[PDB]
Amino acid sequence: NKFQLTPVDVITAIKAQNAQVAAGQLGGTPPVKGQQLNASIIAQTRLT
Amino acid sequence: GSDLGKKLLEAARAGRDDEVRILMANGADVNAADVVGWTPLHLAAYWGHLEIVEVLLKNGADVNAYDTLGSTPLHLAAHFGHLEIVEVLLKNGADVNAKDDNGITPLHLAANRGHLEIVEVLLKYGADVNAQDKFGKTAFDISINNGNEDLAEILQ
Amino acid sequence: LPAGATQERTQKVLNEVTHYYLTKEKNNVESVFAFNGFGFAGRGQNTG
Amino acid sequence: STEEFGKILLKVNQDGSRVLLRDVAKIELGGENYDIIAEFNGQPASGL
């Protein structure tokens, strides 16, 4: 209450900030001609 | 409707020419309409039965019959690419600028499906190129929305 | 192929492999069915 | 069709002009994914 918050906002913040994000790749397919780098993009991961 | 009216409607839809002629000879109403207001001419224009269209017109079919939403056989023929039927209908006095309840003209319909040759025939017969449907759109607007560059040209 | 090697770099090697069989083994080989992107170690742009 | 996807209306600008999907994207029939290049004797191939 002191911060004008509710369990709704807590639940929303956990779903958004305890997330495992599929982010694609550098050099992903179909690629451009001449691409030299393929690597996974790693974004948010589950908290531990 | 009534007796021989219904058999003519189904005959025109199925494309049974000899039977259309026979039902004519027996006094069938050329302008018999079903629940949605489609005449045999509507049906034959929709399904593309050119010969039945001629036979119906030769026998005094309303060339400008409109259904319960204001659409005429010319709308149907122009919408579904039946070029020869569009010419026959226009030759027999079809209102080239007829509008349905939505303000939609045969030119809008022919343009929307890209029937370039139909569009030229309709223009040749006096289609208003600036006609607007209820949303303010012309055949040109339709052409550029469809990205049809050839059509867009023809429609100035 | 090494770490991070791309689909295009793997395709040149497979092309050389395909060329070899249909050239120096013409008498023995009827066909080469080359798959760029999986192996039996695993999948990846660097595998074929 | 690709044409029908291209004329999806994203937005109507202030001046009343239209942003269509084809104004922000190329549109084509393609594959569900592109990780594997398959070739039979060096020609594009599918199979069962």
B150 CB burial (10 A radius; 0-12, 13-18, 19+): exposed
Do B20 and B60 contact (CB within 8 A), yes or no?
no
How far is it, in rounded angstroms, from Cα B97 to Cα B78? 12
CA angle B45, B78, B153 (to 5 degrees): 165
The CB-side HSE value for B137 (13 A sphere, CA atoms) comes to 17
Q: Does A22 touch chain D (CB under 8 A)?
A: no
Q: Kindly report the CA angle at B50 between B46 and B56, in degrees rounded to 5?
A: 90
For residue B144, what is the nearest residue in chain D, using CA coordinates? Answer: D7
Distances, alpha carbon B144 to alpha carbons B147, B154, D18, in Å: 5, 12, 11
How many angstroms separate the CA atoms of B107 and B131, rounded?
9
Maximal C-alpha separation, chain B: 50
D residues 14..43 contacting A (CB < 8 A): 33-35
- Give the amino acid at C6: T
Measured at the CA of A15, the angle between CA A11 and CA A19, to 5 degrees, comes to: 155
In a 13 Å sphere around the CA of B131, the CA atoms on its Cβ side amount to 22
Q: Which of D18, B81, B97, B122 is nearest to B154 (CA)?
A: B122
Query: Which A-chain residues 18-37 have CB contacts (< 8 A) with chain C?
Result: 27, 29, 31, 33-37
The answer to whether residue D22 neighbours chain B at the CB level (below 8 Å) is yes
Residue A32 is given by DSSP the state: P
Q: Any long-range contacts for B24-32 (C-beta under 8 Å, 24+ apart)?
A: B24/B55, B24/B59, B28/B4, B29/B2, B29/B4, B29/B5, B30/B56, B30/B59, B30/B60, B30/B61, B30/B62, B31/B61, B31/B62, B31/B65, B32/B1, B32/B2, B32/B5, B32/B6, B32/B8
Number of residues in chain B: 156
Cα separation, C5 vs B119, in Å, equals 56
User: Is residue B133 a contact partner of residue B121, using CB atoms and an 8 Å limit?
Assistant: no
Closest alpha carbon to B152 in B116, B103, B118: B116
Which residues of B fall within a CB distance of 8 Å from D3?
146-147
Q: Give the number of other CB atoms < 10 A from CB of residue B132.
A: 16
Are C18 and D39 in contact by the 8 Å Cβ rule? The answer is yes
Closest CA to D25 of D42, D43, D8, D40: D8
For residues B21 and B25, what is the distance between their CA atoms, to the nearest angstrom?
6
Pairing status of strand C33-36 against strand A39-42 = unpaired
Q: Which domains does chain B have, with CATH numbers?
A: 5-156 (1.25.40.20)
Q: Is B83 exposed, middle or buried (0-12, 13-18, 19+ CB in 10 A)?
A: middle
CB C7 within 8 A of CB A38: yes
Is A34 in the D-facing interface, judged by CB distances under 8 Å? Answer: no
Asked if C6 and A40 count as a contact pair (C-beta separation under 8 A), the reply is no
Do strands C33-36 and D9-12 pair parallel, antiparallel, or not at all (unpaired)?
unpaired
Subunits next to C (3 or more Cβ pairs <8 Å) are: A, D
DSSP letter for C13, please: H
- Closest to A37 (Cα-Cα) out of C9, B124, D13, B36: C9
For chains C and A, tell me whether 3 or more CB atom pairs sit within 8 A of each other: yes
HEC per residue, C1-48? CCCCCCHHHHHHHHHHHHHHHHHHCCCCCCCCEEEECECCCCECCCCC
**Of A25, A32, A38, which to mutate for an interface test with C (greatest number of C Cβ within 10 Å)?**
A38
DSSP code of residue C26: T
List the structure tokens of B102: 């939505």
Could you tell me the end-to-end alpha-carbon distance of chain B, in angstroms, rounded to an integer?
A: 45
Q: Work out the minimum CA distance from C11 to partner chain A, whole angstroms.
A: 12
To which residue do tokens 């039927």 refer? B85
The helix or strand, by DSSP H or E, that contains position B75, with its residue range, turns out to be helix B73-79
